[PDB]
């Protein structure tokens, strides 16, 4: 399986905060997708991150959010910036291993809350 652990509250002071998901698998040298969203109805996708063996942490956005690429041993880190007041909502983490098939996902990773 895969399990996910992240903060229960993180007040983004001055539109600046760091969000991280504690992932559970081997060190590195595989292929993956570690997504981040906003809403349980999948209202928004905020960022998603993958890196090849040599190729570094590829990082982009699909609703124009600000995202940097940071990776450690078996943990991810999201450098999110440029926040607002209304989009304050719950934030959840996602994971999907590919090799091997099939995929035995995690329960809904509890997530985090921001201000």
């Amino acid at each position, epitope marked *: 399986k895969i399990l996910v652990k992240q903060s229960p509250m993180l007040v983004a002071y001055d539109n600046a905060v760091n969000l991280s998901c504690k992932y559970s698998y081997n060190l590195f040298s595989r*292929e993956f*997708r570690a997504s981040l969203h906003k809403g349980l109805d999948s209202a928004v996708e905020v960022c998603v991150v*993958y890196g090849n063996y040599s190729q570094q942490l590829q990082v982009y*956005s*699909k*609703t*124009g959010f600000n995202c940097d690429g940071k990776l450690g041993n078996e943990s991810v880190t999201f450098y999110l910036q440029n926040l607002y007041v209304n989009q304050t909502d719950i934030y959840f983490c996602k994971i*999907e291993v*590919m090799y091997p*098939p*099939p*995929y035995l996902d995690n329960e809904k990773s509890n997530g985090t809350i921001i201000h």
Partner: antibody, heavy 120, light 110 residues
Framework: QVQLVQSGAEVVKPGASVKVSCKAS????????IHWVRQAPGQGLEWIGS????????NYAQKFQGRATLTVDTSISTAYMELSRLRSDDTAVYYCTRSHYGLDWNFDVWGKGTTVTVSS | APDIQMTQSPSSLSASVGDRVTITCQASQNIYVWLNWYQQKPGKAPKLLIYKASNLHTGVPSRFSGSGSGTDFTLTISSLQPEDIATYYCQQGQTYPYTFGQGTKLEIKT
């Protein structure tokens, strides 16, 4: 040999469905988010849905949900498209196109298209 | 939240062989960068030309360049050639649903 073998010249009345085939090979069939794209003669192309065994949850187009039905099979690396209740305005040239790995923004290799004509 | 609108002009032009042709691609919403240029001669399978706003997709000569500073990007064909006789397309890729479905049919001039 990184391509998509498409089905043959299939033609039937309106309202009846159609089962299309798209065999994949030369790469990881179990990735890359197979798509389907039909070409209505008179204007450009179209889009219906993306498909992956992992996220068979509902991600289609507005007047497409309930009508199209995408499937796959890893044992022979094949994808199938099945449009139902085919109205006359559904006549088009259907393609299966492949997105890049884990993403969907570019279409990598396009299927060789399909003869799909309906009339009267 | 009505999907997306993709405008491509023209439906068909008549440009000579070798003339610099640069076809535009405009949207009604704010797609930061999700354009995809599909060379599609009328009849054959679509051929992706550039897998970004302006990024040379492999298998396509170094003359198929693009450009754009802001909301509306473009594509710069330096020299028009005989194999470019096609119906060009640009894709959007930010939110579902998806319809490029316009057609810029570059017909030959004589």
């Amino acid at each position: 040999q990184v391509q998509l073998v498409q089905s043959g010249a299939e033609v039937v009345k309106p309202g009846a469905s159609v089962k299309v085939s798209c065999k994949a090979s030369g790469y990881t069939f179990t990735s890359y988010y197979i798509h389907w794209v039909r070409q209505a003669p008179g204007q450009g192309l179209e889009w219906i849905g993306s498909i992956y065994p992992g996220n068979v949850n509902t991600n289609y187009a507005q007047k497409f949900q309930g009508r199209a039905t995408l499937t796959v099979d890893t044992s022979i690396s094949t994808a199938y498209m099945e449009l139902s209740r085919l109205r006359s305005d559904d006549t088009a040239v259907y393609y299966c196109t492949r997105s890049h790995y884990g993403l969907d923004w570019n279409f990598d290799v396009w299927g060789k298209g399909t003869t799909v004509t309906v009339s009267s | 939240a009505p999907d997306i609108q993709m405008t491509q002009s023209p439906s068909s032009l008549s440009a000579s062989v070798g003339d610099r042709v640069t076809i535009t691609c405009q949207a009604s919403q704010n797609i930061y960068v999700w354009l995809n240029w599909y060379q599609q001669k009328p009849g054959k399978a679509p051929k992706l030309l550039i897998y970004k706003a302006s990024n040379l997709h492999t298998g396509v000569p170094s003359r198929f360049s693009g450009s754009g500073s802001g909301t509306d990007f473009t594509l710069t064909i330096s020299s028009l050639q005989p194999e470019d006789i096609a119906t060009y397309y640009c894709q959007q890729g930010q939110t579902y649903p998806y319809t490029f479905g316009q057609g810029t049919k570059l017909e030959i001039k004589t």
